Design a protein around this motif. Structure first.
Motif, PDB file in Angstrom:
ATOM      1  N   UNK A   1      60.072 -84.178  41.803  1.00 12.85           N
ATOM      2  CA  UNK A   1      58.768 -83.557  42.001  1.00 12.85           C
ATOM      3  C   UNK A   1      57.871 -83.872  40.812  1.00 12.85           C
ATOM      4  N   UNK A   2      56.560 -83.779  41.018  1.00 10.27           N
ATOM      5  CA  UNK A   2      55.581 -84.117  39.997  1.00 10.27           C
ATOM      6  C   UNK A   2      54.737 -82.929  39.557  1.00 10.27           C
ATOM      7  N   UNK A   3      54.736 -81.841  40.326  1.00 15.70           N
ATOM      8  CA  UNK A   3      53.779 -80.763  40.099  1.00 15.70           C
ATOM      9  C   UNK A   3      54.169 -79.893  38.910  1.00 15.70           C
ATOM     10  N   UNK A   4      55.363 -80.094  38.362  1.00 13.62           N
ATOM     11  CA  UNK A   4      55.845 -79.237  37.295  1.00 13.62           C
ATOM     12  C   UNK A   4      55.029 -79.275  36.019  1.00 13.62           C
ATOM     13  N   UNK A   5      54.598 -80.467  35.625  1.00  7.33           N
ATOM     14  CA  UNK A   5      54.028 -80.667  34.299  1.00  7.33           C
ATOM     15  C   UNK A   5      52.687 -79.962  34.161  1.00  7.33           C
ATOM     16  N   UNK A   6      52.466 -79.325  33.012  1.00  5.62           N
ATOM     17  CA  UNK A   6      51.218 -78.607  32.806  1.00  5.62           C
ATOM     18  C   UNK A   6      50.785 -78.764  31.358  1.00  5.62           C
ATOM     19  N   UNK A   7      49.634 -79.392  31.145  1.00  5.07           N
ATOM     20  CA  UNK A   7      49.054 -79.467  29.814  1.00  5.07           C
ATOM     21  C   UNK A   7      47.815 -78.582  29.771  1.00  5.07           C
ATOM     22  N   UNK A   8      47.550 -78.023  28.592  1.00  4.15           N
ATOM     23  CA  UNK A   8      46.404 -77.155  28.374  1.00  4.15           C
ATOM     24  C   UNK A   8      45.746 -77.536  27.056  1.00  4.15           C
ATOM     25  N   UNK A   9      44.470 -77.896  27.129  1.00  2.00           N
ATOM     26  CA  UNK A   9      43.715 -78.355  25.973  1.00  2.00           C
ATOM     27  C   UNK A   9      42.596 -77.367  25.671  1.00  2.00           C
ATOM     28  N   UNK A  10      42.457 -77.016  24.392  1.00  2.00           N
ATOM     29  CA  UNK A  10      41.493 -76.032  23.924  1.00  2.00           C
ATOM     30  C   UNK A  10      40.761 -76.583  22.709  1.00  2.00           C
ATOM     31  N   UNK A  11      39.523 -76.125  22.522  1.00  3.35           N
ATOM     32  CA  UNK A  11      38.702 -76.499  21.372  1.00  3.35           C
ATOM     33  C   UNK A  11      38.701 -75.333  20.388  1.00  3.35           C
ATOM     34  N   UNK A  12      38.815 -75.643  19.093  1.00  6.78           N
ATOM     35  CA  UNK A  12      39.078 -74.592  18.112  1.00  6.78           C
ATOM     36  C   UNK A  12      37.822 -74.194  17.332  1.00  6.78           C
ATOM     37  N   UNK A  13      36.859 -75.109  17.173  1.00 12.11           N
ATOM     38  CA  UNK A  13      35.794 -74.891  16.190  1.00 12.11           C
ATOM     39  C   UNK A  13      34.596 -74.155  16.790  1.00 12.11           C
ATOM     40  N   UNK A  14      34.432 -74.217  18.115  1.00  9.41           N
ATOM     41  CA  UNK A  14      33.449 -73.424  18.854  1.00  9.41           C
ATOM     42  C   UNK A  14      32.002 -73.812  18.557  1.00  9.41           C
ATOM     43  N   UNK A  15      31.069 -73.215  19.301  1.00  9.77           N
ATOM     44  CA  UNK A  15      29.655 -73.564  19.260  1.00  9.77           C
ATOM     45  C   UNK A  15      29.455 -75.074  19.418  1.00  9.77           C
ATOM     46  N   UNK A  16      29.592 -75.602  20.627  1.00  6.42           N
ATOM     47  CA  UNK A  16      29.413 -77.044  20.809  1.00  6.42           C
ATOM     48  C   UNK A  16      27.947 -77.421  20.917  1.00  6.42           C
ATOM     49  N   UNK A  17      27.383 -77.984  19.848  1.00  9.30           N
ATOM     50  CA  UNK A  17      26.012 -78.481  19.896  1.00  9.30           C
ATOM     51  C   UNK A  17      26.065 -80.004  19.977  1.00  9.30           C
ATOM     52  N   UNK A  18      26.230 -80.526  21.198  1.00 10.21           N
ATOM     53  CA  UNK A  18      26.092 -81.948  21.575  1.00 10.21           C
ATOM     54  C   UNK A  18      26.523 -82.841  20.411  1.00 10.21           C
ATOM     55  N   UNK A  19      25.649 -83.714  19.897  1.00  9.76           N
ATOM     56  CA  UNK A  19      26.042 -84.673  18.867  1.00  9.76           C
ATOM     57  C   UNK A  19      26.264 -84.005  17.515  1.00  9.76           C
ATOM     58  N   UNK A  20      25.693 -82.821  17.309  1.00 10.05           N
ATOM     59  CA  UNK A  20      25.766 -82.185  15.999  1.00 10.05           C
ATOM     60  C   UNK A  20      27.205 -81.822  15.652  1.00 10.05           C
ATOM     61  N   UNK A  21      27.564 -82.039  14.390  1.00  7.57           N
ATOM     62  CA  UNK A  21      28.887 -81.719  13.837  1.00  7.57           C
ATOM     63  C   UNK A  21      29.937 -82.562  14.569  1.00  7.57           C
ATOM     64  N   UNK A  22      31.152 -82.036  14.705  1.00  8.05           N
ATOM     65  CA  UNK A  22      32.235 -82.734  15.383  1.00  8.05           C
ATOM     66  C   UNK A  22      32.868 -81.796  16.399  1.00  8.05           C
ATOM     67  N   UNK A  23      33.273 -82.361  17.534  1.00  5.28           N
ATOM     68  CA  UNK A  23      33.823 -81.586  18.639  1.00  5.28           C
ATOM     69  C   UNK A  23      35.335 -81.769  18.629  1.00  5.28           C
ATOM     70  N   UNK A  24      36.051 -80.716  18.235  1.00  3.21           N
ATOM     71  CA  UNK A  24      37.475 -80.789  17.931  1.00  3.21           C
ATOM     72  C   UNK A  24      38.279 -80.103  19.023  1.00  3.21           C
ATOM     73  N   UNK A  25      39.271 -80.814  19.561  1.00  6.39           N
ATOM     74  CA  UNK A  25      40.105 -80.307  20.637  1.00  6.39           C
ATOM     75  C   UNK A  25      41.557 -80.711  20.427  1.00  6.39           C
TER      76      UNK A  25
END
Length: 1894
Positions: free
Chosen positions: A339-363
């Motif tokens: 079976x293939x449905x078992x696998x589960x990945x979860x990705x989260x961003x830690x630094x918050x306040x995503x302003x487009x190009x400004x700063x860096x977008x960390x996940x």
């Protein structure tokens, strides 16, 4: 007898061929007998051999060997076929013999040329069709005949030979021919010996060939059931990620049937098409063509395989052993699932306040797999793209842990678009261009907010003239901040409209920007960038409209969006010139004065629409610097600084305002310089358009001197001058020199130089004078110069007056009092009043000495300083202070006052010592207490809720000790115990304050600090200044339900640590009423709600619309007027129209509107009632039967149904409000018409009383109030009445003040009785004056006219008037020439006012003057009416002699009873007789001068010419013989007889001069009759001296009579002075004879004499009338004695000796005593010659003889001689002469002379020089003080802010159950058409709702 025989083939086992030949074995047994017999053998071919008979041995039952043992009976066979061999027995050898027995045996001979072989393909199967058989035939003969083959599986007797099979002809050659044998099921599972047999013919026939297994080519049957092989191939549930391992060693294959069995090479299946099945191969350690192992053995010795599956599907791995054709004897299979449905990945961003190009977008991500974890290749996916190497992931965690450590990859995303970050894990490989499998999807999307650029524009020049270049500047500003450590360069390109067309695409703009024409700029990192870019454009032809587009690129991305249009700026044109105008106020400016300037800017061409506004900088030059800018650069620099100011041009506006206000250091003839500039940002260049030209202080001084009074023998005083300027010092400090002019005492004081600090308008100069102590009291003036800047030499003169107090030293006495006194509460107002006094009180007028009193209270540090100007009259200064103590007494406090002479703008002390208060102040501690306690959420105020965290609020009041506004804030610490022990463990040990105040500090609490609901908590709250009430707020949470005892303590909070208890007495707690907490209810009292889209059958409705009232009813109701009845089976929702009174919004509530309005049945909202009406809700009562359709909801008591509800007001109330819910009365002064919006102002004169009797006023009628309103409106008035007769209301309708009590307080209207002398014609706005002739006063109105012309003698209450004015006619005797007076003043002394309407008095006539009353009455002595004394009013009091001899001056006697010449109202009273008037206007009549008489009338005259009369004005003078030397007399006194008067007009008679007299009969002064005060009976006297007659003399004057002259004197002629005596020689002898008779002859008389006297002795007068008697001579004698006529000589003979000789006449004739004598005898004389008688002559005779002679007788004439005649005869007598007369005596000495007068007294002494002046009345002390003004009260404070709501909604209940039945288990075109119709109707509803809200 009987023999048994057996014969068999001893040769080869196979059937014989042609060459092999055979041998035979034959045995013969004979049980019956044993006798020798001879045997013979015959073969199938008899030609070959003929055997002979041979003997046998012993036969018997046991078999005996015979025939071929080693003999030659064996014969080869040539022919091929079946042969028969016969063994025959003969008893004897002789032919033929006896044949006992013969036996025949058949043998089959095959063919050597023929070859037959059998082939088996696979291993045979039990029970299952095994058809792998083939046969090969190869005949050596060239042409072989047809043939038939049979196969026999086994040689067992049970098995039988198969049927014939036609294999074929096999016609040609010796090549092999192959034939297929049909299927045969083998049944033994043991070794078989299959035999193939060949026949020439189908039935019987010869045997051609046989084929046998021949040493291990045998058919071996194999049973499929004995085989079991084990696979044990790895794991079963492993996924596509894991590699399954085939361990060939572990697998065992065995047959378990027999030791020897055929081998089959195995082949195993993946069941995976990707990789083919295995090559078919033998087991381990084994060789081909060998027996299969009987024991379990591995398939391969050292083989291990790893395999991964390609898709997540079930697989069957099957092993099977093959031999021959691919047909399976047995296979063993094992299943594996994926079976293939078992696998589960979860990705989260830690630094918050995503302003487009400004700063860096960390996940970062974690990927979890439950079990059998292995590597999966993970790809990270941003907005686009996925990595090619695809990273790498390792699995070191179980599936329990969600986040696994995967490489934290961070990216920067571009633009505001969302990202939707996607991580995808592909399983299988991925490096060799093969796709892994997709397992999770699971994408994260976060929302971002980008940053936006801002662009600004400004050009120069601002409007382009043709063929003039321009420069456009653009400002770039970025949003928020640049990322740290990143720098950006922008390339911007602009294309002018005139230069060329704008590029269509972005590529051309990018190329232009990259070019040299494009401009590159840099941005500083980590800051706000404000960049400027400039482009130059030149126009060949001028254009009205400018439109420019600019594009900027940062890197490869343009700053502006390509879809959005490029920026467009409209930048004006035509370069108009600007016109500037100036205005200034005032025209002239003193030094440092603010001045107003305002400036108008006008532009010819208005700004076009759609463009930016025009900012312009105006530059102003104050003139302080000295030189204004002459170039554009300097003016631009000025504008860029603070001096220049800015303005903006409004779009389409041409008028601009700019105002300003500078300061000057020095006034100059200047108007400040203007410049107009507009420039690009950051001041790049300077450009000016218009130019303009210029359009063309004060001080005060206060001087005070301290001490004012000079002191002898003391320190000099100090004089202080304070100079104030209106203008503040701006640039530099100024120094002023104060000079005081010399006052003449102590020389001129030196000048004083005083410096003023910068920013100070006040300077002080100090002067001291040494000789000021001896200064004379008087005024001094001081002139002070002031210098400031250029303006110089200002003059200020101040005047004062310095007294002289002498050697005395003044003192000031200070006394302090307080009205409240003792005791004072903490923080309460206290008023102090200080009296400062000076007993001597020396300052009077000159210098007021201002005082400063400072107050100091017991603060203890060791202050409302106030100044009062000492008034030069009163010596008491009253300082009023407030102290506002804020500390405890600690034994009391003292107040100290200090006095300073210096005032306003404290060097010298004016008191020698400070003075403390007489009574130490006593301060009482506060009496604050907790006013109340309340809880906001609670079932009842006493008990709060159980579960709800209730808030306790305590209210603190500081009572009358209100904190002062101007003081520090006071704070209190309030601490409680709720009584619960759920919190901080054990309860407090004691109730004492010490533990309670320490508790815990909770003044600021966090929401989840866990002390928020503390049972014991202390908070600190600060009271604001000016407020009295304090709130202490506390949160409490109760864990369980039960009684609780709350205790509360209050402490004063000061200096960190809390103080003692603020309540009275130590350790006093306020204990709230103990309570039991009640259950907490759940109910949201929120607005009317609607669920979402609930299914309903039909009529039932979630909501009704615009006004209708929900009816949960089976009553059909289309709209709201019902229709059908009992319509629906089960009740459904409806809605009614509702009644009139209420109105409804949204479909819920038929709420009656507020008071002012009214409504209809089903309108949305109550419509507005007109202004004047009342719109009361009218009676509704209720519903009684209760089954009737309800009128409305029950509580709606009364309703206003339709327009018939709005009811107006009655007459006399105004309703200015639109609502009109009730009606305010018309106040005092405005009168309503209808239910007026506003009452009307009446006019001036009418006021506020009831007017019921008057017709057509509008007073409210009975139908107005009674019928409709009932008892809400009483009856009140609405009218105006003119102020009545002679009263006026001076204002327009200031109403009559009405009092409800009628008999007690007679109310009034405010209009007066007016003042005196004014009538009002009934009503008016003002009184009317009286016309002249008439008058008026308040106290009276009327007359009393002509009183004395009444015979009664009393006035008359006279009531006569002029109608048109009503003004009372002045009483006769009074007039009114004037319009206005209160009493009209009487007539003065000397006129008449007879008629009533005296226009004016008139002068009384020449003959008649005035006096009160008539003349006769005034002279009436008698009384006719004894009561009133009217006709006994007497006024004369004459001066005359009363009747009879008596004479009583004041005939009329008494003080005068009637003298008024003034109060005259009748006939001019004719004159008093002593008086008269020559003219008309004489006040008091004039008594007649001395000498005259004015008779009482013409006729009654004493001595008058009857032609002349006295017409009342004429006083006619007296007659001769009369006198009067006084005034006011009727007639003149007729003189007494002595004094005679001759001239007319005499005050005196004249003296009767001597010589004359008066004897008159009727001559005496007139007799005054007592009756009428009049003289009478006067007749004139003698007019003449009427001289004396002769005979009578009057030497006495003043006489009546003449007296006769006496004896001896005569009176010759009348008028002679006195008698003259008769002259000597004459005599008179009677009295009264005028002629003197002459004396007799010879008689003499002396002067005077009664009679003539005769001469004495011898003398004679000798004449008549002679005066002397002369003594005659001697020789002579007189005629007679004592009387003689003459004297004659003596006779002849005689002689007379003596002169005094007289004859005696008696005796001898002529003889006398002294006379003549004879002489004797001798003697003779003879001739009377001599007295000597001669003694004769003696004669001579002859010559000689002489003879003597003797005369004869005595005297004889002749002598005779002697002797002749007798000598002797002579006898006679002889005598002697007498002695001579003696000499006369000497005269006596004269009488002594009179003495000299003695000196009178020296002249009298002088009257004294004036005595001194006693002092005037005393100076007045001071008067009482004035009352003070009140202070307005304060308004209420604003309310406290509302508390916040609770926290969110609480966590939801996770939800569960189903509420379902039956118990369950244990746990298209019309479609979218109708849905679109639903959407369209919903949109139409939304549109209608939007229209409704607007």
């Amino acid at each position: 007898a009987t023999y048994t025989l057996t014969l068999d083939k001893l040769g080869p086992t196979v059937n014989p061929t042609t060459s092999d030949a055979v041998t035979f074995t034959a045995t013969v047994a004979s049980p019956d007998s044993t006798t020798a017999v001879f045997f013979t053998l015959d073969y199938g071919d008899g030609v070959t051999a003929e055997t002979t008979r041979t003997t046998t041995g012993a036969l018997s039952t046991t078999p005996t060997a015979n025939l071929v043992s080693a003999g030659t009976y064996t014969v080869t066979y040539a022919s091929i076929g079946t042969k028969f061999v016969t063994l025959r027995l003969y008893d004897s050898a002789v032919a033929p013999g006896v044949l006992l027995a013969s036996k025949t045996v058949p043998i089959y001979v095959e063919d050597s040329t023929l070859t037959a072989t059998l082939l088996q393909s696979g291993v045979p199967r039990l029970n299952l069709a095994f058809s792998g058989f083939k046969g090969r035939v190869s005949s050596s003969t060239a042409n072989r005949a047809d043939m038939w083959a049979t196969i026999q599986l086994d040689t067992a007797p049970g098995v039988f030979e198969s049927s014939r099979i036609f294999i074929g002809i096999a016609p040609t050659a010796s090549t092999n021919y192959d034939f297929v044998i049909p299927d045969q099921v083998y049944n033994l599972e043991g070794a078989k010996t299959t035999v193939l047999r060949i026949y020439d013919a189908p039935v019987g026939g010869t045997l051609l060939r046989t084929f046998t297994p021949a040493a291990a080519n045998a058919v071996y049957v194999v049973d499929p059931s004995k085989y079991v092989l084990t696979l044990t191939v790895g794991p079963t549930s492993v996924t596509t990620a894991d590699q399954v391992t085939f361990t060939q060693t572990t697998t065992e294959v065995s047959y378990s049937a027999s030791a020897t069995s055929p081998i089959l090479q195995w082949r195993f299946n993946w069941d995976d098409p990707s990789v083919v099945e295995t090559p078919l191969a033998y087991p381990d350690a084994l060789t081909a063509a060998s027996n299969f192992p009987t024991t379990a053995t591995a398939v391969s010795s050292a083989a291990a395989s790893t395999f991964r599956y390609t898709s997540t599907g079930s697989k069957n791995a099957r092993l099977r052993l093959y031999d021959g054709a691919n047909n399976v004897i047995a296979e063993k299979i094992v299943v594996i699932t994926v079976s293939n449905a078992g696998y589960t990945l979860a990705l989260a961003k830690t630094t918050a306040d995503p302003v487009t190009t400004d700063d860096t977008i960390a996940f970062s991500a974690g990927a979890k797999h439950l079990s059998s974890t292995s590597q999966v290749w993970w790809t990270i996916d941003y907005g686009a793209g996925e990595s090619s190497p695809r990273t790498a992931l390792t699995m070191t965690n179980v599936g329990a842990a969600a986040p696994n450590a995967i490489a934290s990859l961070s990216n920067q995303y571009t633009s505001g678009g969302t990202k939707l970050a996607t991580l995808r894990i592909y399983d299988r490989d991925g490096v060799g261009a093969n796709t892994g499998l997709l397992l999770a999807s699971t994408t994260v999307t976060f929302t971002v907010t980008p940053v936006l650029y801002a662009l600004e524009s400004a050009v120069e020049p601002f409007s382009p003239i043709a063929t003039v270049a321009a420069k456009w500047s653009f400002r770039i500003q970025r949003s928020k901040a640049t990322p740290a450590g990143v720098t950006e360069s922008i390339k911007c390109a602009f294309f002018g409209a005139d230069t060329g067309t704008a590029p269509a695409d972005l590529a051309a703009w990018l190329t232009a920007a990259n070019g040299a024409g494009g401009l590159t700029a840099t941005i500083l990192p980590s800051s706000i960038p404000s960049d400027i870019i400039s482009f130059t454009r030149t126009y060949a032809a001028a254009a009205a409209s400018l439109q420019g587009k600019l594009q900027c690129f940062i890197g490869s991305t343009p700053l502006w969006d390509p879809y959005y249009p490029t920026p467009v700026f409209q930048v004006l044109a035509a370069a108009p010139t600007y016109t500037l105008s100036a205005s200034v106020t005032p025209a002239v400016v003193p030094v440092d004065t603010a001045t107003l300037w305002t400036y108008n800017i006008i532009r010819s061409v208005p700004v076009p629409a759609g463009g930016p506004s025009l900012p312009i900088l105006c530059s102003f030059w104050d003139g302080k610097t000295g030189a204004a800018p002459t170039t554009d650069a300097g003016w631009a620099a000025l504008a860029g600084s603070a001096n220049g100011k800015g303005t903006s041009m409004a779009p389409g506006s041409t008028t601009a305002t700019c105002s300003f206000t500078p300061s000057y250091s020095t006034t100059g003839t200047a108007t400040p310089t203007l410049q107009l500039i507009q420039n690009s940002f950051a001041l790049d260049a300077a450009t000016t358009v218009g130019f303009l030209s210029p359009v063309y202080a004060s001080y005060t001084i206060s001087s005070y001197l301290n001490p004012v009074t000079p002191v002898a023998g003391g320190a000099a005083a100090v004089w202080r001058i304070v100079i104030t300027r209106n203008a503040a010092v701006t640039a530099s400090a100024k120094t002023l020199t104060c000079q005081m002019p010399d006052n003449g005492q102590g020389g001129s004081p030196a000048d004083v130089t005083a410096d003023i600090a910068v920013g100070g308008t006040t300077t002080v100069c100090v002067f001291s004078i040494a000789g000021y102590t001896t200064a004379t009291p008087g005024p001094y003036f001081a002139t002070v110069n002031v210098v400031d800047g250029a303006v110089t030499t200002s003059h200020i003169t101040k005047n004062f007056t310095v007294l002289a107090s002498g050697t005395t030293a003044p003192t000031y006495a200070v006394t302090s009092v307080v009205s409240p006194a003792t005791p004072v509460k903490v923080s309460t107002p206290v008023t102090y009043t200080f009296t400062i006094t000076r007993t001597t009180a020396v300052p009077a007028g000159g210098i007021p000495q201002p005082i400063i009193c400072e107050f100091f209270n017991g603060e203890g540090t060791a202050a409302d300083t106030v100044v009062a100007v000492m008034a030069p009259g009163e010596t008491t200064t009253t300082c009023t202070f407030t102290t506002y103590y804020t500390t405890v007494s600690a034994g009391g406090f003292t107040a100290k006052l200090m006095v300073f002479g210096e005032s306003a703008t404290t060097p010298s002390q004016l008191l020698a010592a400070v003075h403390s208060f007489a009574t130490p102040m006593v301060v009482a501690a506060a009496v604050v207490a907790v006013e109340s306690t309340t809880i906001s959420p609670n079932y009842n105020p006493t008990t709060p809720y159980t579960n709800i965290p209730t808030y306790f609020t305590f209210t603190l009041l500081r009572d009358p000790p209100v904190p002062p506004s101007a003081s520090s804030g006071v704070q209190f610490a309030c601490a409680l115990y709720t009584g619960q022990n759920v919190n901080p463990a054990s309860a407090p040990s004691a109730i004492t304050d010490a533990v309670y105040k320490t508790f815990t500090d909770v003044t600021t609490a966090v929401a989840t600090d866990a002390n928020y609901f503390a049972d014991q908590q202390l908070r600190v709250v600060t009271m604001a200044p000016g407020t009295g009430r304090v709130s202490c707020t506390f949160p409490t949470l109760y864990a369980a339900a039960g009684p609780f005892s709350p205790k509360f303590f209050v402490f004063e909070y000061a200096s960190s640590t809390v103080g003692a208890n603020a309540l009275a007495v130590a350790d006093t707690v306020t204990s709230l009423t103990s309570f039991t907490t009640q259950a907490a209810p759940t109910f949201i009292t929120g607005p009317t709600n609607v669920p979402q889209r609930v299914p309903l059958p039909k009529g039932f409705r979630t909501t009704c619309f615009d006004g209708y009232e929900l009816i949960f009813s089976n009553d059909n109701y289309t709209n709201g007027v019902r229709v059908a009845v009992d319509a629906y089976p089960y009740p459904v929702g409806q809605c009614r129209k509702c009644p009139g009174g209420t109105a409804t919004m949204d479909g819920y509530r038929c709420i009656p509107c507020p008071s002012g309005y009214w409504s209809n049945e089903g309108a949305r909202e109550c419509t507005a009632c007109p202004a004047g009406t009342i719109a009361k809700p009218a009676a509704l009562t209720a519903r009684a039967k209760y089954s009737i359709d309800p009128t409305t909801y029950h509580f709606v008591t009364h309703l206003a149904m339709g327009p018939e509800s709005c009811k107006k007001c009655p007459k006399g109330y105004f309703q200015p409000n639109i609502a009109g819910t009730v009606c305010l009365p018309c106040p005092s002064g405005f009168v309503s018409t209808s239910g007026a919006t506003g009452c009307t102002a009446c006019s001036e004169g009418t006021y506020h009383t009831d007017g019921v009797g008057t017709t057509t006023p509008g007073e409210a009628t009975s139908l107005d109030t009674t019928d409709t309103f009932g008892s809400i409106y009483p009856i009140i008035p609405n009218t105006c009445r003119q102020c009545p007769a002679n009263t006026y209301l001076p204002l327009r309708g200031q109403a009559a003040i009405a009092s409800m009590n009628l008999a007690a307080v007679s109310s009034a209207t405010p209009c007066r009785p007016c003042e005196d002398g004014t009538w009002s014609k009934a009503g008016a706005a003002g009184c009317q004056k009286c016309p002249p002739g008439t008058y008026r006063n308040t106290w009276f109105s009327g007359q009393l006219g002509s009183p004395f012309i009444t015979a009664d003698g009393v006035p008359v209450a006279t009531t006569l008037t002029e109608l048109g004015s009503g003004c009372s006619q002045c009483p006769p005797g009074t007039y009114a020439p004037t319009f206005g007076m209160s009493v009209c003043l009487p007539c003065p002394a000397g006129t008449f006012a007879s008629a009533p309407g005296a226009t004016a008095c008139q002068q009384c006539k020449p003959g008649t003057n005035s006096l009160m009353g008539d003349r006769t009455q005034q002279m009436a002595l008698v009384v006719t009416n004894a009561a009133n004394d009217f006709p006994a009013l007497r006024a004369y009091t004459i001066s005359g002699m009363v009747a009879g001899p008596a004479y009583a001056k004041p005939i009329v006697t008494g003080p005068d009873t009637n003298f008024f010449m003034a109060g005259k109202s009748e006939t001019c009273s004719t004159n008093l007789p002593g008086y008269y008037t020559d003219v008309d206007g004489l006040p008091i009549q004039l008594p007649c001068k001395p000498g005259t008489f004015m008779p009482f009338d013409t006729a009654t005259a004493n001595l008058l010419d009857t032609g002349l009369t006295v017409d009342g004005t004429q006083c006619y003078t007296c007659q001769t013989g009369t006198f009067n030397d006084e005034f006011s007399q009727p007639v003149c006194k007729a003189c007494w007889s002595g004094s005679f008067a001759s001239k007319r007009g005499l005050p005196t008679c004249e003296i009767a001069q001597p010589g004359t007299f008066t004897n008159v009969a009727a001559a005496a002064n007139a007799t005054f009759n007592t009756a009428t005060l009049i003289p009478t009976g006067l007749v004139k006297g003698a007019q003449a001296p009427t001289p004396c007659g002769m005979g009578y003399f009057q030497s006495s004057a003043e006489t009546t009579t003449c007296t006769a002259c006496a004896v001896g004197t005569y009176a010759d002629q009348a008028g002679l002075a006195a008698c003259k005596p008769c002259q000597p020689g004459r005599y008179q002898n009677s009295i009264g004879q005028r002629v003197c008779k002459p004396c007799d002859m010879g008689t003499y008389s002396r002067y005077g004499g009664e009679l003539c006297t005769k001469c004495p002795a011898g003398t004679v007068a000798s004449k008549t009338g002679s005066s002397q008697c002369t003594p005659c001579a001697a020789g002579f004698y007189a005629n007679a004695p004592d009387s003689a006529t003459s004297c004659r000589a003596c006779p002849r003979g005689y002689y007379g000796p003596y002169s005094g000789a007289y004859a005696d006449n008696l005796g001898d004739e002529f003889e006398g005593p002294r006379g003549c004598y004879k002489c004797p005898y001798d003697f003779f004389a003879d001739r009377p010659g001599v007295r000597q008688c001669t003694a004769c002559p003696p004669l001579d005779l002859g010559g000689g003889n002489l003879v003597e002679q003797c005369t004869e007788d005595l005297g004889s004439q002749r002598c005779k001689p002697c002797s002749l005649l007798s000598k002797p005869k002579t006898a006679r007598t002889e005598q002697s002469p007498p002695p001579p007369s003696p000499s006369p005596p000497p005269p006596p000495p004269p009488s002594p002379r009179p003495p000299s007068p003695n000196p009178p007294s020296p002249r009298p002494p002088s009257p004294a020089p004036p005595s001194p002046n006693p002092p005037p009345t005393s100076p007045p002390p001071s008067p009482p003080p004035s009352p003070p003004p009140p202070r307005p009260p304060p308004p209420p404070p604003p309310p406290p802010s509302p508390p916040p709501p609770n926290r969110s909604p609480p966590p939801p209940p996770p939800a569960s159950s189903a509420i379902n039945p039956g118990g369950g288990v244990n746990q298209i075109l019309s479609l979218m058409e109708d849905e679109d119709a639903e959407a369209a109707q919903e949109e139409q509803a939304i549109v209608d709702v939007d229209a409704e809200m607007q």
